[PDB]
Design a protein around this nucleic acid. Structure first.
Lengths: 52, 51
DNA sequence: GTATTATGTAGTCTGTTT
DNA sequence: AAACAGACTACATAATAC
């Protein structure tokens, strides 16, 4: 299922500050790009961080 | 058998610049610490970087 | 060495959910 | 309204790159 930004962060090898994760999203570092459902990002469970 | 700094670095989950790996060695971040043998560092196969 | 990039905390801004 | 989520910026330091 979709994860919240904090829930996706908590499953990564090195969780970061939520502001950091948000910056990754703004910078197109997350594949697939999270959808903003209303006020919050939804991450695919299989979303990964990529180097651009 | 020992590995070279380049060989060790290519085998990690995120290889870094040589400069950075050398700095980690200089800062004793790597265990077991590499042996300096002549001009090269020699890494144990099991050597990991401790955070 | 110096410069650039990555990260962190805060305040204020737009907008969403209750 | 009030709490929430996130954007954007100002301000920092650390790690990495040059």
């Amino acid at each position: 299922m979709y994860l919240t930004l904090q829930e996706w962060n908590a499953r990564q090898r090195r969780p970061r500050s939520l502001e950091t994760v948000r910056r990754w999203v703004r910078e197109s570092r997350i594949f697939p790009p999270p959808v903003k459902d209303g006020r919050e990002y939804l991450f695919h469970e299989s979303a990964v961080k990529v180097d651009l």
